[PDB]
Write a protein that binds this ligand. Structure first.
Ligand SMILES: CCC1=C(C)/C(=C/C2=NC(=C\c3[nH]c(/C=C4\NC(=O)[C@H](C)[C@H]4CC)c(C)c3CCC(=O)O)/C(CCC(=O)O)=C2C)NC1=O
Ligand SMILES: CCC1=C(C)/C(=C/C2=NC(=C\c3[nH]c(/C=C4\NC(=O)[C@H](C)[C@H]4CC)c(C)c3CCC(=O)O)/C(CCC(=O)O)=C2C)NC1=O
Ligand SMILES: CCC1=C(C)/C(=C/C2=NC(=C\c3[nH]c(/C=C4\NC(=O)[C@H](C)[C@H]4CC)c(C)c3CCC(=O)O)/C(CCC(=O)O)=C2C)NC1=O
Ligand SMILES: CCC1=C(C)/C(=C/C2=NC(=C\c3[nH]c(/C=C4\NC(=O)[C@H](C)[C@H]4CC)c(C)c3CCC(=O)O)/C(CCC(=O)O)=C2C)NC1=O
Ligand SMILES: CCC1=C(C)/C(=C/C2=NC(=C\c3[nH]c(/C=C4\NC(=O)[C@H](C)[C@H]4CC)c(C)c3CCC(=O)O)/C(CCC(=O)O)=C2C)NC1=O
Ligand SMILES: CCC1=C(C)/C(=C/C2=NC(=C\c3[nH]c(/C=C4\NC(=O)[C@H](C)[C@H]4CC)c(C)c3CCC(=O)O)/C(CCC(=O)O)=C2C)NC1=O
Ligand SMILES: CCC1=C(C)/C(=C/C2=NC(=C\c3[nH]c(/C=C4\NC(=O)[C@H](C)[C@H]4CC)c(C)c3CCC(=O)O)/C(CCC(=O)O)=C2C)NC1=O
Ligand SMILES: CCC1=C(C)/C(=C/C2=NC(=C\c3[nH]c(/C=C4\NC(=O)[C@H](C)[C@H]4CC)c(C)c3CCC(=O)O)/C(CCC(=O)O)=C2C)NC1=O
Ligand SMILES: CCC1=C(C)/C(=C/C2=NC(=C\c3[nH]c(/C=C4\NC(=O)[C@H](C)[C@H]4CC)c(C)c3CCC(=O)O)/C(CCC(=O)O)=C2C)NC1=O
Ligand SMILES: CCC1=C(C)/C(=C/C2=NC(=C\c3[nH]c(/C=C4\NC(=O)[C@H](C)[C@H]4CC)c(C)c3CCC(=O)O)/C(CCC(=O)O)=C2C)NC1=O
Ligand SMILES: CCC1=C(C)/C(=C/C2=NC(=C\c3[nH]c(/C=C4\NC(=O)[C@H](C)[C@H]4CC)c(C)c3CCC(=O)O)/C(CCC(=O)O)=C2C)NC1=O
Ligand SMILES: CCC1=C(C)/C(=C/C2=NC(=C\c3[nH]c(/C=C4\NC(=O)[C@H](C)[C@H]4CC)c(C)c3CCC(=O)O)/C(CCC(=O)O)=C2C)NC1=O
Ligand SMILES: CCC1=C(C)/C(=C/C2=NC(=C\c3[nH]c(/C=C4\NC(=O)[C@H](C)[C@H]4CC)c(C)c3CCC(=O)O)/C(CCC(=O)O)=C2C)NC1=O
Lengths: 60, 162, 172, 145, 162, 172, 162, 162, 172
């Protein structure tokens, strides 16, 4: 199915951006992305690697 | 809406910088050109009823066939819709004159124009004729740069229909 | 994204009627005094790093806990982020000043900033204090009667103060 | 071009123009071929610029112009150019992407480009891709330019 | 370079559309402000040698510790390069004034400025002082609006250095 | 995305059993009047501009407040959006009719449609009325016996009515 | 173009795999549908001139004003172009009947239809009228599955025009 | 699940368009070839137990060393799991026969097959031999297009294993 | 992409004319023979791993230098690529067999394959040889009478051979 992942960044993403430098224009922290089941795992791993914080996931 | 000010601020914000001379000269041009545009808006708002009636009659003169029964122009309701649409176009032309940008025209008429007209089989040539009449009349009741402003916006609408 | 003219046109279109002669007079006045508006925006822009430096010195003199280790602006990168946020707020305030409408500030900079700071752990009240300090430095720089012909621009001062206060209120 | 979530009509139309000029290799796209549902999804906020680009790359316009009449070499170099804004750096990219398409299909091959760390570093969910390789990029191979 | 007309054309082109009312009004503002800007550039060009010598002297007065033996400000070559740099800045300020945009500055001076100054250990404060001088004498050299444009561009350079 | 055959497969699998003889007869029946269903799908497909224009005319006659300033079909942009939405809903209804199942209509069209309309200020009752009007026009077109072999098709009309009503329920 | 065999092969190609039972069944259905389709194409080809003349006359019957001077139907060259366009549409419908896909129509007529009509000020309702006439006539020339095939393609073209 | 109908609808949905003659002809081919496929599915369902037991015995004949102690096959539980696995494969072959597409097989067996078989050290050759036995008995249990369809699906499963 | 029908339509369009009666007759014959075509394509698809394995065994018995260290199919990686390429070519040959046209084979598979193999150091003579061995195995399977109704299918045999040897000619 499709799952909505609400993402937050509380500093791990912040320090990664501080090291690498702002490299695409800055954006707000809390945001939500819809992901299908096929792309569910890679998107999850990608968020975890980036230092992103996921506050909740909803199935619809 | 796309105005000189909004485009200024947008091209500044897209690259994340403060507004500089390249932006303030553009805003200055808008402020200076406001006066003829406001004059033209005043003139076009005064004469809206005559312009709308003349435009509808011009459309019917150029397209006698549309009034015939079974056609789009037949009936009292259809001609009421025609007058209302010409009123819309004139109103948005005045809005665009006041804002000094095609932003109102683009947002309220031009966006979704083709799809709506094809859905209801509205021929854009009718509105070209109405706007051409309004242009001919605007050659009167206005003079100087105000006429230039008004015709620039009117013919913008014409090009969007064409 | 609106300005004074686009907002007025929006209300006129919701009522469904042409712009009134009172509205035309108001907007013609706005465009006649837009020269002072350009002077105010230029004053805000040309002195932006000075405003930010002054406000940072004042804020870090007053709120000393931020600088110390464990404070929100201690790690040297967090100081960089503080400065970047101050510059962003100043930039959007100047944008809104030029437009004459506060919507460009809000919809693009302030709508999510509260939730961002709360998720981060930043003290929003100190950010509001920094915004007010920037308001003070900016008022000093706009009121500079040099470099421009003297004139009455109390409306511009009030408008800039409203933008700074509204940014502070939305942050904290 | 960056396209946030609340956007005006002119910003939206300009972003669409830029996206079509880049993702479709400056190829004329006709009014009958434009994706209105994908544009609706982007207009709402259901997808980002990135998910829109992924849709467009999976669309029949892209497939027909860049995949179905080409060799996989041309498709890989062209996908690098259009989705990453850069040229392939070595033969390992060709081999990797050819094996990826062969074993997992076309969609996984597009997802590799769009889910790549390079894409997210430079374009990241909201900016339209652009040509990067006209400036030095870290890890470039001096023949990429 | 990034000027009023070039930004206008770049925005029109990026959206794949002609030049409308907004863009022409911006260009109109540019064409009006050309007069003060061009003759401010004329006045700055006329007094270039005095301005450069004074800016160098101001740098040395504020930074006496550069000129004694052993560091950047010592030697005829270094002082000649100082004159060359201040002349560069003045040249591109006049260019920006003529072009009615910070394109000349942004493209020739500001782009790469920090990396270059860091590599050669050139303090930006020296140039900030030189430009503040230039501002002081352009205050008295220029009157009315010309003073205003020249100040906008001088301050854009200063801001980029700081 | 699911059809009647894959729906039967999934129902058999959750029990872990081979498809029963009864299931085989129902599926073979479905396959015999598949040609009957293709004509209904083609009737929906060919007459879509007619169906949408008819429903739009009736809806904007019944509810004028959508088309005056302040209504939700007022500018050309929202009007085009409305016509597009009718296009889309008819498309997904026809997909469901061909598949024999409404799984596509739930999965892709209506997954979060009501929330979208609520956020945009769209009166979901107006959209439901539009879907009902399209259902009326579509029933008018499906029942046409011109250019087709005469036969009983009450099942197809009933099923298409269920699809239209289900879409209206999900939107409203 | 874009026909059942081609969709099959393209789907297999993009998924990096062979042709399986689902795709071979699609191809099967195409191969049996070819019989009424080729029959319809042959019948329409045999009667192309009668169909084209009748379509032009129906167009002139439904839009009397177009023949009047100063309009798109006035003159011999304009009516030669009438008949040429109707022949184009008929040819591409027969192509699509033979190909068992709408690909010939989509690639030769529909892609670029709206822009070209808008540029030359051609009215889509003219061609809808002509295709309606062809539909009515192929109702007589054809029967059975041949007629439903022809009507599906003619209706695809009509829906493209509207 | 990938079936003829589902592939049809997914293609049209991805293009954001209606189902036209292409999609309908593919659907028609599916609906026509349903009846031999459902005949084959009923035939294979009827002779479940004989097919599965013969397949297990064939696996043990071709792999005598499996049943001896110390191997994966020895024991009652591993025997039971052998029977269960062959029954699963037969069940999903019947599913794919009914659903006119390999989608049930791809979703329920092929997806994740290799890593599951690697983790449990199950030789694909065992199941290939069982499926070859299933083919051998299908050759006599069925005749005509039903046998062709059943063979297509069984050998799709085999090619997935090999 | 092109099948036989679409090429015919393409030349007819180039002349600007309808399709002549003889062309329609040829396409009718093609569609009549289409079921035999489907059997040929399914024989290629179903027995593909066997064909690839037989071709590989024969090729590497014939040319042992390919599998010695320093050969072009020596390490596991190059051997996997070799088998992958053989599978890909056979798969595009099956596509061309179904389409009745060699267009997809040229456009996709053989577009620039000779220059690819020349740059890789791959012996194009050996690749052509592998294509010939695949052709032989394919003919062995396609001439099989078990599980098909007996009939004359020589045109399909010759056409399959032309696809195979056209691939081998483009490579070498
Ligand atoms: C639309 C424009 C926009 C703004 C304005 C914005 C604010 C913003 N501030 C941030 C961090 C920060 N912001 C601040 C600044 C505050 N804390 C200090 O106490 C100061 C008193 C005060 C500054 C006045 C600090 C210190 C951080 C770092 C937080 C941390 O790393 O723990 C971050 C997270 C950085 C990241 O994820 O890489 C954002 C997004 N974001 C935007 O997209
Ligand atoms: C990025 C961090 C991360 C998470 C959050 C994670 C959990 C995780 N488990 C998943 C599915 C799954 N996970 C399981 C786990 C099994 N179920 C039980 O029977 C077993 C005891 C248990 C073994 C642990 C199963 C069966 C599924 C399939 C769910 C389904 O499709 O029905 C998925 C979705 C897979 C996809 O859609 O592609 C995730 C993300 N793995 C990760 O690397
Ligand atoms: C905000 C900008 C805006 C515009 C411009 C606009 C035009 C417009 N005019 C309409 C009605 C109409 N308007 C006309 C105009 C005709 N009357 C004849 O006297 C003339 C030949 C001709 C005019 C020159 C006609 C025939 C209709 C009825 C169309 C129909 O529903 O069949 C409709 C459809 C009304 C409905 O949904 O029921 C629209 C959308 N609508 C808008 O929201
Ligand atoms: C290139 C960018 C640009 C700028 C900056 C600009 C400003 C500008 N300021 C002006 C005078 C002025 N400038 C100001 C500004 C005020 N004076 C007070 O001291 C306040 C502190 C200050 C508010 C910030 C005022 C009040 C006038 C006189 C207005 C008038 O002429 O009636 C004038 C008219 C001078 C003339 O032609 O006679 C301009 C065009 N125009 C531009 O195109
Ligand atoms: C820098 C801005 C710019 C330009 C100038 C431009 C021109 C341009 N025209 C193109 C196609 C074309 N251009 C033409 C026009 C010619 N046909 C002849 O009959 C006419 C005499 C003549 C026009 C006067 C045609 C027919 C094609 C399509 C060729 C085809 O489809 O085979 C293409 C290839 C893209 C495509 O085929 O979709 C480009 C790049 N593109 C740009 O981005
Ligand atoms: C989709 C159409 C298409 C095809 C088929 C294609 C083939 C292709 N084969 C390649 C490598 C290869 N191909 C082969 C095949 C050879 N091995 C022995 O020499 C045999 C004689 C012969 C096969 C019978 C080998 C060994 C390699 C590895 C070359 C190397 O690593 O140097 C490569 C370079 C990337 C890679 O290593 O995978 C391509 C692009 N390219 C395409 O765009
Ligand atoms: C990883 C290996 C690698 C290298 C080294 C590399 C160099 C490189 N130098 C470039 C430009 C340049 N390179 C130079 C440097 C030269 N001109 C000066 O006069 C000196 C004589 C001399 C240096 C000692 C200059 C001046 C440019 C700018 C050229 C221009 O765009 O006008 C560019 C074009 C993109 C850009 O402007 O950043 C590249 C890619 N690229 C690579 O992929
Ligand atoms: C997956 C398939 C899909 C669906 C179902 C879909 C529906 C959809 N309709 C939308 C807007 C809309 N939908 C409508 C239609 C309604 N408004 C009422 O006034 C009318 C009675 C009625 C017409 C039937 C309107 C007017 C909007 C624009 C609302 C706005 O701009 O505020 C939007 C968001 C913005 C946009 O696209 O313009 C979506 C996502 N989009 C999709 O990609
Ligand atoms: C190219 C796409 C395609 C289509 C469209 C198609 C439709 C189709 N309709 C048919 C007859 C039919 N068509 C219908 C449809 C009903 N008739 C009533 O008037 C209802 C209004 C209508 C409900 C939609 C019926 C009931 C039959 C008779 C089927 C039978 O003999 O059992 C037949 C069988 C003709 C025969 O063997 O005599 C087909 C194949 N087949 C295709 O391959
Ligand atoms: C491949 C398919 C194809 C089509 C369909 C096509 C239509 C077409 N018809 C044209 C001429 C025309 N076609 C018409 C329409 C006819 N005359 C009117 O009296 C009737 C109402 C109407 C009959 C329905 C007219 C009036 C012209 C002349 C337009 C002009 O040159 O201004 C033109 C302008 C170019 C030219 O001078 O030939 C096009 C593009 N072109 C194509 O390449
Ligand atoms: C629906 C699709 C599906 C399949 C196909 C399937 C096969 C399957 N069989 C299993 C057990 C097994 N199955 C066998 C089968 C062997 N027995 C011998 O007589 C034969 C030589 C050979 C079969 C021909 C064996 C030995 C095991 C035990 C393996 C182990 O526990 O490590 C297992 C591991 C689960 C467990 O042991 O709890 C799977 C996944 N499962 C599924 O969900
Ligand atoms: C890079 C290193 C490398 C490895 C590891 C490798 C393995 C390998 N061994 C092969 C031959 C083979 N090798 C074996 C293995 C032995 N035969 C039996 O005596 C034993 C039970 C069994 C080993 C324990 C077998 C059975 C074959 C047969 C393949 C064939 O007949 O074509 C082949 C096929 C090529 C050929 O025909 O010779 C490969 C690829 N190849 C490599 O290039
Ligand atoms: C799901 C995929 C699918 C397949 C596989 C398929 C094959 C198929 N083969 C058929 C007969 C046939 N098949 C063949 C071909 C074979 N005869 C010779 O042995 C050759 C070796 C070989 C050709 C390669 C022949 C000659 C016929 C007899 C019908 C005729 O000649 O027209 C028929 C007609 C009914 C019958 O007689 O059984 C079908 C539908 N149809 C499909 O929808």
């Amino acid at each position: 199915r499709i799952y909505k992942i609400t993402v937050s960044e509380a500093g791990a993403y912040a320090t990664n951006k501080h090291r690498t430098g702002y490299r695409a224009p800055i954006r707000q922290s809390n945001y939500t992305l819809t992901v299908p089941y096929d792309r569910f795992l890679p998107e999850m791993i990608r968020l975890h690697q980036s230092g992103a914080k996921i506050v909740n996931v909803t199935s619809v | 809406s796309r105005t000189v000010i909004t485009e200024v601020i947008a091209t500044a914000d897209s690259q994340g910088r403060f507004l500089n001379s390249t932006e303030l000269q553009a805003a200055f041009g808008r402020f200076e050109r406001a006066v003829p545009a406001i004059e033209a808006a005043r003139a076009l708002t005064k004469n809206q009823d005559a312009l709308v009636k003349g435009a509808v009659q011009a459309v019917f003169k150029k397209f006698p066939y549309v009034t015939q029964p079974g056609e789009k122009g037949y009936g009292d309701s259809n001609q009421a819709k025609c007058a209302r649409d010409i009123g819309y176009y004139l109103r948005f032309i005045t809005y665009s004159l006041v804002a000094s940008g095609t932003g109102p025209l683009d947002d309220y008429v031009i966006a979704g124009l083709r799809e709506v007209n094809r859905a209801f089989n509205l021929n854009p040539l009718w509105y070209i004729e109405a706007l051409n009449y309004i242009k001919g009349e605007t050659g009167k009741l206005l003079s100087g740069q105000s006429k230039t402003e008004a015709l620039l916006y009117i013919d913008h609408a014409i090009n969007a229909l064409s | 994204m609106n300005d004074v003219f686009t907002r007025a046109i929006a209300q006129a279109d919701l009522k469904g009627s042409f712009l009134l002669e009172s509205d035309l007079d108001k907007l013609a006045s706005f465009a006649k005094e837009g020269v002072k508006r350009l002077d105010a925006v230029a004053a805000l822009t040309n002195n932006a790093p000075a405003i930010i430096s002054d406000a940072a010195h004042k804020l870090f003199a007053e709120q000393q806990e931020l600088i110390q280790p464990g404070g929100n602006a201690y790690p040297h990168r967090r100081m960089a982020a503080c400065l970047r946020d101050m510059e962003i707020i100043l930039r959007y305030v100047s944008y809104a000043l030029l437009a004459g409408d506060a919507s460009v500030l809000d919809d693009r900079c302030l709508n999510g900033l509260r939730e961002t700071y709360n998720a981060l752990g930043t003290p929003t009240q100190s950010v509001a204090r920094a915004v007010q300090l920037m308001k003070d430095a900016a008022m000093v720089h706009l009121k500079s009667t040099a470099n421009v012909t003297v004139g009455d621009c109390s409306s511009l001062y009030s408008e800039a103060a409203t933008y700074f206060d509204k940014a502070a209120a939305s942050i904290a | 071009i960056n396209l946030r979530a609340p956007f005006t009509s002119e910003e939206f139309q300009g972003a669409l123009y830029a996206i079509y000029r880049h993702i479709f290799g400056n190829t004329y796209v006709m009014e009958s071929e434009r994706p209105t549902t994908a544009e609706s999804q982007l207009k709402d906020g259901r997808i980002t610029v990135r998910g829109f680009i992924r849709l467009l790359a999976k669309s029949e316009v892209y497939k027909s112009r860049f995949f179905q009449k080409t060799s996989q070499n041309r498709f890989i170099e062209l996908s690098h150019k259009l989705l990453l804004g850069r040229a392939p750096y070595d033969q390992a990219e060709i081999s990797y992407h050819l094996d990826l398409w062969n074993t997992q299909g076309y969609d996984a091959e597009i997802d590799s480009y769009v889910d790549s760390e390079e894409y997210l570093d430079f374009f990241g969910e909201d900016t339209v891709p652009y040509f990067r390789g006209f400036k030095y990029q870290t890890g470039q191979s001096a023949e990429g330019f």
